Amino acid sequence: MNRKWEAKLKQIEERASPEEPPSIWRLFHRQAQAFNFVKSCKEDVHVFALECKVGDGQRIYLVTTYAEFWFYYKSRKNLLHCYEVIPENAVCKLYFDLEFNKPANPGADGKKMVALLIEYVCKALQELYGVNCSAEDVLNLDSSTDEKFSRHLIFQLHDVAFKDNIHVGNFLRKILQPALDLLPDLSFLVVKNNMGEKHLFVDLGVYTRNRNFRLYKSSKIGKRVALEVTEDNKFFPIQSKDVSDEYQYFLSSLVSNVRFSDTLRILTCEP
DNA sequence: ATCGCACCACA
DNA sequence: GGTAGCG
Ligand SMILES: Nc1ncnc2c1ncn2[C@H]1C[C@H](O)[C@@H](COP(=O)(O)OP(=O)(O)OP(=O)(O)O)O1
Ligand SMILES: [Ca+2]
């Protein structure tokens, strides 16, 4: 309700300022106008944010289908620097943004940090929710450079999803509370930043309303490194004669792309 | 013309 | 509260 109030008050602030093939492809200046269009649309359409030429993090918002988006995106000629918008209150996969500064952390073995993180999360999902999974259900995406160990993990739980990304965040700050206290041996998550201050390997700042999350094969606009399937990745989509593996990987990586299932379990976690 | 949320603060 | 620095 509070969220409903501030969101509409921002829109009040903004008010103060020969058949062709079926294709939906609309751009908007305000992310709220994009969602207005989505609700009005009646086709399974989703919101993307495109970083426009700048150093700025300014975005325009694109509205289309996953299938049509991929069609114009997959060559990586255009639509560089693209972001998934994780809609508030939509069911979503459990995901992670993991990063640490490599010079500031000469001892850290990032590969083992993800493997031990995944194991603890899988134990947490079993103990708290009865969900059984393993690293074979984790899509491992890498955007690392020589300065930064950067990885995105997207869990592919069978017939399971979280109520929305706020609840993913509540679930994570609950199970990571021992780690947040070093600020059952979760010390392997603590890392130094540039200024020597210890933080977590797990970035807790991405579980926010309408969080932008950088697409598979997109780079930040300043940069050249794009998210790509990590070498050690152990999640493999079932192969299909009807879709390319790369499209399979794309759809798995979309946090809001919850597999339509008739037996779906929805996980909640309250603060 | 993006968006939506730790560290200080006063009292 | 009260914001600006962050993601
Ligand atoms: N200025 C911004 N405006 C809107 N959304 C943002 C902004 N900065 C970051 N985000 C969103 C998109 C990012 O994918 C997500 C995680 O932040 P961040 O770690 O800085 O980027 P990243 O994980 O995609 O790349 P990196 O490899 O640099 O860590 O938060
Ligand atoms: Ca990151």
Ligands, deduplicated:
2'-deoxyadenosine 5'-triphosphate, calcium ion
Strand content is: 15-25%
The computed structural class is alpha+beta
Q: Please, how many helices?
A: 7
Principal-axis shape: globular
Strand ordering within the main sheet:
1-3-2-4-11
Question: Main sheet?
Answer: 5 strands, antiparallel
Approximately how much helix is present in the residues? 25-40%
Number of strands: 13
User: Ends: how far apart?
Assistant: 17 Å
H/E element sequence = HEHEEHEEHEEEHHEEEEHE
User: Radius of gyration over alpha carbons?
Assistant: 19 Å
Describe the structure.
This is DNA-directed primase/polymerase protein. It is found in: Nucleus; Mitochondrion matrix; Chromosome. There is one protein chain. This protein has about 270 residues and is of the alpha+beta class. The chain is built from 7 helices and 13 strands. It has helices spanning about 1-15, 30-40, 65-75, 110-130, 165-175, 175-180, 245-255; strands spanning about 25-30, 45-50, 60-65, 80-85, 95-100, 140, 150-155, 160, 190, 200, 210-215, 230, 265. The strands form 4 sheets. The chain has a 5-stranded antiparallel beta sheet with strand order 1-3-2-4-11. Strands 5-7-6-12 form a 4-stranded antiparallel beta sheet, with helices on both faces. Strands 8-13 form a two-stranded parallel sheet. Strand 9 and strand 10 (about 200) form a beta hairpin. It is globular, with a radius of gyration of 19 Å.
